Design an enzyme around this catalytic site. Structure first.
Site, mmCIF file in Angstrom:
data_model
loop_
_atom_site.group_PDB
_atom_site.id
_atom_site.type_symbol
_atom_site.label_atom_id
_atom_site.label_comp_id
_atom_site.label_asym_id
_atom_site.label_seq_id
_atom_site.Cartn_x
_atom_site.Cartn_y
_atom_site.Cartn_z
ATOM 1 N N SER A 82 -5.086 -1.514 -2.768
ATOM 2 C CA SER A 82 -4.016 -2.242 -2.899
ATOM 3 C C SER A 82 -4.452 -3.604 -2.670
ATOM 4 N N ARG A 83 -4.383 -4.237 -3.644
ATOM 5 C CA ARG A 83 -5.094 -5.504 -3.519
ATOM 6 C C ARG A 83 -4.238 -6.474 -2.660
ATOM 7 N N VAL A 84 -3.023 -6.257 -2.460
ATOM 8 C CA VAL A 84 -1.827 -6.624 -1.838
ATOM 9 C C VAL A 84 -2.197 -6.381 -0.559
ATOM 10 N N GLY A 85 -2.207 -7.073 0.352
ATOM 11 C CA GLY A 85 -2.418 -7.099 1.781
ATOM 12 C C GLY A 85 -1.957 -5.705 2.660
#
Lengths: 265, 48, 83, 85, 120
Positions: free
Chosen positions: C34-37
């Site tokens: 998940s490149r989103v934090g």
């Protein structure tokens, strides 16, 4: 191309599968005979051991080891090498006699002072008394076996039908036989040198058993190994099959585009 | 001649009558080379 | 697929092998990122879930080479991983 | 190069990359709108490379033993030795 | 970048991410523009167009500008003509490969497919 280079490589992978299948079956065939021999050998051994047990014989140093000439029989070759190394730490000065090319090569690497006598040609046949006897006779003459205060033989005990654990046992010295805790009403011959003769007799009788245990473990390992090979090869077939299928599709599309481009103009 | 060598020759003689199975004959066949080593260095390999 | 992968933030790849072999939902953890934090999930589920993503990419590693001689360290990890 | 060759002074011409000439000709031809050949390269792409390469050759002793030596330096398209260029 | 490089004369830096998008964008307009496309569908002005931009970015005698350009390999096949033509114009490259990404090593730079003129 992509297509042809893929396709030839997949053909190679296929051929590898076929060979690993073939070997695996043949190994099983060979194994049945191997096991038969080992049973008989082990039965014989117990009778000799019956004396040593009841006598409670209780023992540089010699190390003898057993592996076949043949390679690619899994990790028989290197597990035994590892256990030789372990007991080579223990006694630095011991003379190692290697029965088998594979143990010869590996052992030679770890310390190249060990090798004093070595054999070659034992591994391709079932254990046979003839072999054991000749090796024993040479062991006495060449290495002057009686001098060592310990003799030990290392081999691969075929522990369970899918395993082999490297194991060792001590061949009792002629001195040992003499002074044995109970050398009670064992013996009566004070004329015939029953210790000095029994030593020689058990040098071979023990060695044959060790060789036999080993041969069975070796063939059993080869069967196991070639079986795992077939599985690994199967996985590679499946993986390259998907690659092949994709590559084939891609060639059709790419070629098609070229024709279209021409027509369009 | 070791004790087990003594027995060995006797055994070989015993496979001589001619009614004997192939496996007996196979047990009398052997093929090996005792390759002597020293130090590294290898004195020549010679059949048993 | 690649063109879409490039646009999206993270991927949650699902793997056929796992799906077949009775893990539903069959969320392969090798290819899910998940490149989103990690400031997405609530702090409670950040604290408790600390390093579990790492651990299950250690189970992945352990069982990768499990198929030789398993030492107690590998076995402990394997036992944890399997459970 | 031919000035060397004619003068009878041996010389050698490295054409690096010849592959980039092909890419260049592709653009040129395709916006003249000549029919596009196989793999989109021009139809007379073989002719382009052939006319260039055949112009270096050892001359006879009659013509002063000149000789342009040529080395084209084609880029492989990533391994494909069967690609058109 | 040029304004800084030349006229203001200080060392600059330039990052262009993702410069495949420049190439790609050209391919999109190309069909409409009216040119029969080149192989793999890219604009038939592919070589020149990549050229004009990528040679404007250079360390002039006026000043030095270290530039970092990122190329999205489409489909992940580097042999595709559009990523391929990018490779020529770069002094060092550090190709990052999907396989090494799967093995878990991040950064995913392929260790056998990187080169730099400085490596020498």
């Amino acid at each position: 191309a992509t297509l042809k280079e893929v396709e030839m490589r997949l053909k190679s992978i296929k051929n590898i599968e076929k060979i690993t299948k073939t070997m695996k079956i043949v190994a099983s065939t060979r194994l049945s005979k191997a096991e038969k021999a080992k049973i008989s050998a082990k039965k014989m051994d117990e009778a000799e051991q019956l004396f040593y047990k009841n006598a409670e014989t209780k023992n540089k140093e010699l190390i003898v080891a057993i592996t076949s000439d043949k390679g690619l029989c899994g990790s028989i070759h290197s597990q035994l090498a590892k256990a030789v190394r372990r007991h080579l730490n223990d006694q630095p000065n011991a003379d190692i006699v290697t029965i088998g090319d594979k143990i010869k090569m590996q052992l030679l690497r770890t310390h190249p002072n060990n090798i004093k006598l070595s054999i070659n040609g034992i591994g391709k046949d079932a254990p046979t008394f003839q072999e054991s006897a000749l090796i024993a006779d040479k062991l006495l003459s060449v290495m002057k076996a009686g001098t060592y205060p310990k003799i030990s033989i290392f081999y691969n005990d075929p522990v369970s039908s899918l395993s082999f654990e490297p194991s060792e046992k001590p061949i009792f010295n002629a001195k040992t036989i003499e002074q044995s805790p109970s050398f009670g009403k064992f013996e009566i011959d004070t004329d015939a040198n029953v210790p000095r003769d029994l030593f020689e007799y058990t040098l071979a009788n023990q060695m044959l058993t060790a060789m036999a245990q080993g041969y069975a473990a070796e063939i059993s390992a080869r069967r196991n190994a070639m079986d795992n090979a077939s599985k690994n090869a199967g996985d590679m077939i499946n993986r390259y099959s998907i690659l092949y299928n994709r590559t084939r599709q891609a060639v059709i599309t790419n070629e098609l585009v070229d024709i279209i481009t021409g027509a369009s103009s | 001649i070791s004790y087990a060598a003594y027995l060995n020759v006797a055994a070989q003689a015993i496979r001589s009558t001619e009614l004997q199975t192939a496996s007996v004959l196979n047990r009398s066949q052997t093929d090996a080379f005792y390759t002597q080593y020293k130090n590294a260095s290898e004195p020549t390999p010679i059949t048993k | 697929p690649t063109n879409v992968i490039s646009i999206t933030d993270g991927q949650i790849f699902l793997e056929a092998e796992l799906f077949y072999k009775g893990i539903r939902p069959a969320i392969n953890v090798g290819l899910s990122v998940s490149r989103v934090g990690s400031a997405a999930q609530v702090k409670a589920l950040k604290q408790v879930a600390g390093s579990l993503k790492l651990f299950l990419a250690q189970y992945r590693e352990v069982a990768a080479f499990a198929q030789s001689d398993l030492d107690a360290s590998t076995k402990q990890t394997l036992v944890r991983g399997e459970r | 190069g031919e000035w060397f060759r004619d003068n009878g002074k041996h010389a050698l011409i490295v054409y690096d990359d010849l592959s980039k000439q092909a890419v260049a000709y592709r653009q040129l031809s395709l916006l003249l709108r000549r029919p596009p050949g196989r793999e989109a390269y021009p139809g007379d792409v073989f002719y382009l490379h052939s006319r260039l390469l055949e112009r270096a050759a050892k001359l006879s002793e009659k013509e002063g033993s000149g000789s342009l030596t040529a080395l084209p330096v084609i880029e492989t398209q990533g391994g494909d030795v069967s690609a058109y260029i | 970048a040029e304004y800084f490089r030349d006229e203001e004369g200080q060392d600059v830096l330039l990052f262009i991410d993702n410069i495949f998008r420049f190439t790609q964008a050209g391919s999109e307009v190309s069909a409409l523009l009216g040119r029969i496309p080149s192989a793999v569908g890219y604009q038939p002005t592919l070589a020149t167009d990549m050229g004009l931009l990528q040679e404007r970015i250079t360390t002039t005698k006026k000043g030095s500008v270290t530039s970092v350009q990122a190329v999205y390999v489409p489909a992940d096949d580097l042999t595709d003509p559009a990523p391929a033509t990018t490779f020529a114009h770069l002094d060092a490259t550090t190709v990052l490969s999907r396989g090494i990404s799967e093995l878990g090593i991040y950064p995913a730079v392929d260790p056998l497919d990187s080169k730099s003129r400085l490596l020498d």
